[PDB]
Design a protein around this ligand. Sequence first.
Ligand code: BCL
Ligand code: BCL
Ligand code: BCL
Ligand code: BCL
Ligand code: BPH
Ligand code: BPH
Ligand code: SPO
Ligand code: LDA
Ligand code: LDA
Ligand code: LDA
Ligand code: LDA
Ligand code: FE
Lengths: 240, 301, 281
Amino acid sequence: DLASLAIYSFWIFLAGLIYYLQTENMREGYPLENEDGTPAANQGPFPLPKPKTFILPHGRGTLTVPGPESEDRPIALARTAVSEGFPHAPTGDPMKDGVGPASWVARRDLPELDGHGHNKIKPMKAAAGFHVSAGKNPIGLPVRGCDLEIAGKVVDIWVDIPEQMARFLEVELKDGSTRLLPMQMVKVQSNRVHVNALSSDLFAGIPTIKSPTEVTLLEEDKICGYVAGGLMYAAPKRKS
Amino acid sequence: EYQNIFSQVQVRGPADLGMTEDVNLANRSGVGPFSTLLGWFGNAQLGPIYLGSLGVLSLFSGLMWFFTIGIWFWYQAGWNPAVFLRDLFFFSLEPPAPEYGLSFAAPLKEGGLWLIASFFMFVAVWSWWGRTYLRAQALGMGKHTAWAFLSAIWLWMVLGFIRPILMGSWSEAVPYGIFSHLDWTNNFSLVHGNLFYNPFHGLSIAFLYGSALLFAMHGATILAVSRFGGERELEQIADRGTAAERAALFWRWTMGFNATMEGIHRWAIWMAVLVTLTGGIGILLSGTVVDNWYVWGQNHG
Amino acid sequence: ALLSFERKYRVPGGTLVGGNLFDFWVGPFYVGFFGVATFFFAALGIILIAWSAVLQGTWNPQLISVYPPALEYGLGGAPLAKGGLWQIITICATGAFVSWALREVEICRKLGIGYHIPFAFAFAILAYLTLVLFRPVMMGAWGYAFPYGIWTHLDWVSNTGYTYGNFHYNPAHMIAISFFFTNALALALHGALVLSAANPEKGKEMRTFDHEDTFFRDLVGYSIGTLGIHRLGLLLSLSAVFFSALCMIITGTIWFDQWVDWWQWWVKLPWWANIPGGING
Ligand code: BCL
Ligand code: BCL
Ligand code: BCL
Ligand code: BCL
Ligand SMILES: CC[C@H]1c2cc3[nH]c4c(c3C)C(=O)[C@H](C(=O)OC)c4c3nc(cc4[nH]c(cc(n2)[C@@H]1C)c(C(C)=O)c4C)[C@@H](C)[C@@H]3CCC(=O)OC/C=C(\C)CCC[C@H](C)CCC[C@H](C)CCCC(C)C
Ligand SMILES: CC[C@H]1c2cc3[nH]c4c(c3C)C(=O)[C@H](C(=O)OC)c4c3nc(cc4[nH]c(cc(n2)[C@@H]1C)c(C(C)=O)c4C)[C@@H](C)[C@@H]3CCC(=O)OC/C=C(\C)CCC[C@H](C)CCC[C@H](C)CCCC(C)C
Ligand SMILES: COC(C)(C)C/C=C/C(C)=C/C=C/C(C)=C/C=C/C(C)=C\C=C\C=C(C)\C=C\C=C(/C)CC/C=C(\C)CCC=C(C)C
Ligand SMILES: CCCCCCCCCCCC[N+](C)(C)[O-]
Ligand SMILES: CCCCCCCCCCCC[N+](C)(C)[O-]
Ligand SMILES: CCCCCCCCCCCC[N+](C)(C)[O-]
Ligand SMILES: CCCCCCCCCCCC[N+](C)(C)[O-]
Ligand SMILES: [Fe+3]
């Protein structure tokens, strides 16, 4: 009857919806590769979708996906085995080389803009009208590493202007040079900012930004990558 | 480490007046107060709400539907506020009896107030829907929010309007009351041979369970990659970063496949939309085409 | 067998148990120690369910059903065909899920991401463990747990419900339902918002976060932002399953009467308990 026609129709609808959904989710990372970068023989039953093009907002151009995929960078890794499916060892220092938990991607070397075309993320000193409104103010606080040594001190908060939100703390090293630490990787305490991911001696190694009043999407990725990677790689120097 | 459920440090600056685009700035309000309370979790700004012509129609109708039920609850309470507060969940505005069919000629103390309140709800919802569409056209955005909302409208539309009409009676509709609309729901299942046997009801459940499953997955995933600025999803679509890669790879390594940053939101909007879509079909077929889902299930047909 | 960007991530390390013994992939799947654990518990459990299918005399999945021991057995063991198979399968299931969560933690460490996912999954595991384990033990028999079958588990839901009248009236159950409905509402909106910004009217430029913020302010007068909606989703969901577990742990244990009659505490509050008029006077 009408009911079992509906339910039968629905199951066919749902299969085509699953198909559409899965192919939609193949616009990045595909086609699949062998560990050496050549196209894998078995792609699975789903085809790559017809490409689509995003018109990016601020004269920044076009993105078409799926498109030609490449890491626009060297990968310092080597096979540990003669067959597929095993770990690939770092050939140098994985923090510096940017592999493993320390990975970054070659994102565009421009900063993210807001809807009005202005830098999304600014230092708060250069940010008109922005102040700490609640919680402990971190600015001026010393910064500790996972080895319980002081690495530096906070000299500003970089804020997301549209989201009105702290994204980085800017930290001054014994150099007098500064680095960015991501907010999501620091514990703002009563008397200090604590950083579990990194030990004091790795703060110098944090990638630096090339202008001091903006971060680029490429630089955000190299910084967040570096400091996350310390959870694994700075675990010798971690005490508590 | 820090988990990122509440912000450690709040930060305020100048009230944000929003993107202009094609919006009639004349109809926007002024930025309201900043809530420090709200800003530990989300934004602090209770800033501007756009109140156009449709917004006022919707808000007037809504309060009218809301007050129509309310005066009736007082008439039942004997105008005594102590009884009103004692029996609040027990009061009920019920539809017209089967006698009056699909007619509007019927006394107020016998379903007339029900028709009135329902008319007001009908215009409150559809105007708000048009508002959801128009609000998006002004900003030049796609109409996704308006389509997803149409799906919720569907179940609602079926329960109170479409299905009462195909049965030829307003008595088949849901009454206005906390405990009574619950009773109606239990009663409905009982009168149709146990709704657990309705194959659309069970699909609706799969999608509802799956909505909690998906958002648990997605939300937890964005929090896990927020240390690489994963929440900035829109830019991560235009220019994939390491946040989107370790998010995809977590799931590929766990269950053998993965989404994209855009793709996960198509999964999301559909999983939810199908809740009330299949649900509305399951209710519409009950009492029009299938009298008893136990019986139907024995010989599907 | 690799995503174009995947190789740089497939490094050694992060395992919780067994060093580099199980540190490898099979196709897309990470293995690890708990990968092996999950396979064991999953293989065993599936074998026992097949062996429970022969004791019943069906290879029909719509009919197959593994029942708990009857109430007579209490919190003790049972003969295989009479409830011991359920009891063992239950131990196997618990082993499969806990192993799956801990395998998610090893994947987390290798990728250097947070632990929010294994954490969220443990609420699901907790709801299961409430039904098959915690509520049974507090009540005094495995027989109160639900059976493993596609429709027979729905039977249990229905009978367990109506043991207490219309189960709508369980107040923790009311709260649980609200979060479920609210979560699906939030998932619809979040999905719709991002997609409407990424996929604008034809020919227009890809919209921005500010357009998302503006849209929601225009509409409802407030907007929660990018971090907040993902915090909201995780929380509506985790809360729904929390109150679900809660509504069942109190049922048959501290409350065993009709749930509709619980609500008499409100109506017989002495200051209005006697006044005439209304529904309850
Ligand atoms: C879905 C199929 C059935 C049905 C079955 C149920 C069941 C079963 C339950 C409800 C519940 C609710 N139903 Mg109902 N309900 C239906 C159709 C409706 C419609 C409608 C179609 O227009 C409306 C307006 C409601 C409205 C309501 C609310 C009073 C309540 C929670 C809503 C919610 O969380 O949404 C999310 C939307 C929001 C805007 C967010 C709301 C979040 C907060 C503020 C609400 C807290 C409620 C809390 C549990 C306390 C309840 C006590 C009273 C509020 C005094 N129902 C049909 C007839 N409904 C639950 C209830 O608690 O009833 C007493 C409940 O257990
Ligand atoms: C949760 C509270 C109640 C309950 C109430 C209901 C009600 C009410 C309904 C279901 C429904 C379903 N229940 Mg139940 N169910 C319970 C506990 C469980 C558990 C468990 C705790 O381990 C499992 C495995 C299931 C599984 C299932 C599915 C067969 C079905 C749809 C699930 C879904 O879409 O969720 C979302 C999850 C996903 C989309 C992820 C994919 C999950 C897949 C689909 C599960 C299939 C596994 C199944 C075939 C068993 C395989 C075991 C071995 C591997 C062979 N329920 C308890 C007793 N369940 C609906 C149904 O259609 O019944 C026939 C229905 O109407
Ligand atoms: C004794 C009860 C019966 C039963 C009878 C029913 C009935 C009857 C119905 C359901 C329905 C549903 N049931 Mg059932 N159900 C039972 C047992 C279960 C169990 C379980 C045992 O575990 C589960 C998991 C469910 C789960 C579900 C849902 C999947 C489904 C509702 C989807 C929804 O989100 O509506 C919530 C959403 C809406 C109603 C959308 C409406 C929104 C509108 C547009 C606007 C509202 C707001 C308004 C303007 C007012 C403003 C107020 C604001 C606060 C300002 N049922 C048993 C067998 N069930 C529904 C269904 O779809 O069946 C197929 C349905 O009608
Ligand atoms: C006639 C039926 C009764 C009733 C009796 C009950 C009873 C009794 C129960 C509920 C429960 C629930 N009810 Mg009720 N309920 C009724 C009507 C309703 C209505 C309605 C009428 O609209 C609604 C919306 C609900 C809604 C709900 C939810 C709050 C809750 C189920 C969610 C849950 O617990 O997830 C929790 C999720 C899980 C346990 C799943 C765990 C998954 C595990 C960890 C992993 C599975 C892996 C799998 C095996 C592997 C698959 C592998 C393959 C590769 C896929 N009920 C009426 C009044 N209700 C249940 C509850 O609250 O607690 C459980 C419950 O037991
Ligand atoms: C797929 C279906 C799911 C879903 C999705 C969904 N719902 C939606 C949408 C979507 C995608 C919208 O875009 C739309 C929305 O606007 O979201 C914010 C909406 C919406 N879903 C809502 C509710 C809702 N949806 C529900 C369910 C569901 N919606 C499912 C989970 C339910 C359930 C569970 O039953 C409810 C309760 C509304 C919040 C909103 C539509 C609002 C509306 O149309 O009403 C018009 C206005 C009134 C009735 C207001 C009067 C009544 C009030 C009680 C008075 C207070 C208002 C005000 C504060 C007065 C101020 C006056 C003066 C004092 C200033
Ligand atoms: C906060 C809880 C919410 C949620 C979240 C959630 N679930 C999760 C996760 C998260 C965060 C994951 O990381 C994990 C995942 O991997 O998702 C893809 C998962 C997961 N949630 C799942 C299911 C699931 N979640 C459910 C519910 C919920 N999960 C809530 C909505 C339900 C419901 C609503 O019923 C189901 C069916 C799986 C897809 C997955 C876990 C997969 C897994 O544990 O693998 C190990 C086990 C096996 C391969 C099979 C073992 C078989 C057993 C040994 C025998 C069978 C025993 C069983 C009792 C049979 C009963 C069947 C009958 C009842 C029909
Ligand atoms: C404190 O006192 C004051 C003054 C503030 C007032 C108090 C008010 C109170 C206490 C109000 C309480 C209201 C409640 C609790 C309402 C509860 C509703 C519930 C629980 C569920 C709602 C379900 C209703 C649905 C499914 C209605 C669907 C309606 C339609 C699909 C449209 C109906 C249309 C009709 C009959 C025809 C209209 C005419 C045409 C053709 C356009
Ligand atoms: C294979 C028979 C036809 C099945 C139809 C299923 C369609 C599912 C939706 C896919 C199209 C999606 N959409 C609407 C975004 O274009
Ligand atoms: C609810 C489950 C839906 C399942 C949809 C299909 C999942 C398998 C997709 C495999 C595509 C990927 N791969 C690994 C071949 O690249
Ligand atoms: C709808 C019933 C349950 C469906 C379960 C589907 C399991 C999907 C897992 C397939 C993963 C596949 N792959 C491509 C990695 O081999
Ligand atoms: C939590 C949701 C709250 C929604 C209501 C608050 C947002 C709108 C505030 C408008 C206040 C306007 N003003 C100052 C012109 O009166
Ligand atoms: Fe998202």
